[PDB]
């Protein structure tokens, strides 16, 4: 069903793990959960209070309250039975592990986007400020200065009073993690032709950070393939959605630049992280011949993916949300992390 993304290199068994952060050595005792899974749970646990919220309110399943109940304990339960016996639920546990528990916890109880009225009240306003956020850009004559530019809106896509205003107050440089400048050197060069992009979550940071950076992608010589998930997770944006987005959007023209180089991707997804060596075949169809991938948000580039291996040149962009994803890097909160890996 599921193939491997193409720009993993060949042999990806024993040699890509979709992780990032490890809680567990095989020297462990596998009937104890160590106190990197019991913290790490705890980030999913004190992920319930809001996720039973967005699901009690959710209006559009009937007896939605009573339903947010079954899901807040039947998760709680499971996070429990992992830290008495981390073998089950097809442990150790690793963050995909931990987010699929969420995601199935939820569905099975009768929910498939309960993350609604949020996606829409973003893609809303942030619809009604795609022109004026683009407008800028454009008039930033440098090309490498306004690389920076677009590059500071993908992080503030992410947190983000409004969304120009976040763009100019991210965690002072040196980032995390900064490859900025080596980057902007071979941006300069323009050598890219086959862009795809795992964005994350809809509205400004799907609207004013990705797609604004993807036009100047295309108005610089390139084919953008934007990759989203099969199914909603969290305020993700899926490929239906971003559809309907551009849809909007579009001469067919993205405020006077042609589109027809912007193609949408099915990425297979269903959670709000990825395990790339399992994706949709339509997407490894798309990014065959890719030069320039990208995994946008702090599941697919940091907390997955942050250290893969790729044949092409690469860069992991997100901004860091989890005080744990801090830690493990050295960071601080709502740092900004741009890796960039040329070759
Ligand atoms: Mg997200
Ligand atoms: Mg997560």
Sequence with gaps: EMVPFPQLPMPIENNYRACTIPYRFPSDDPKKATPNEISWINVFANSIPSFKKRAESDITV?????????????????????????????????????????????????????????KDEENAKAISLFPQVVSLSDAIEDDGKRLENLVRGIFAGNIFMSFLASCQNLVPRPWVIDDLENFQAKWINKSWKKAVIFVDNSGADIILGILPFARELLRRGAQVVLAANELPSINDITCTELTEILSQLKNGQLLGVDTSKLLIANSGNDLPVIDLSRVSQELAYLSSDAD????????????????????????????????????????????????????
């Design 292 to 343: 320039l991938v990208i995994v946008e948000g702090m599941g697919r580039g940091i907390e997955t993916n942050l250290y893969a291996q790729f044949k092409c040149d690469s860069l992991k962009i997100g901004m860091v949300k989890h005080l744990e994803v801090a830690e493990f890097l050295g960071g601080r909160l709502y740092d900004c992390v741009f890796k960039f890996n040329e070759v």
């Design 62 to 118: 009937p007896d939605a309250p009573a339903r947010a109940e079954k899901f807040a304990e039947r998760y709680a339960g499971i996070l429990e039975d992992l830290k008495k016996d981390p073998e089950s639920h097809g442990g150790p546990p690793d963050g995909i592990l931990l987010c699929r528990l969420r995601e199935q916890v939820l569905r099975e109880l009768g929910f498939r986007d309960i993350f609604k009225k949020v």
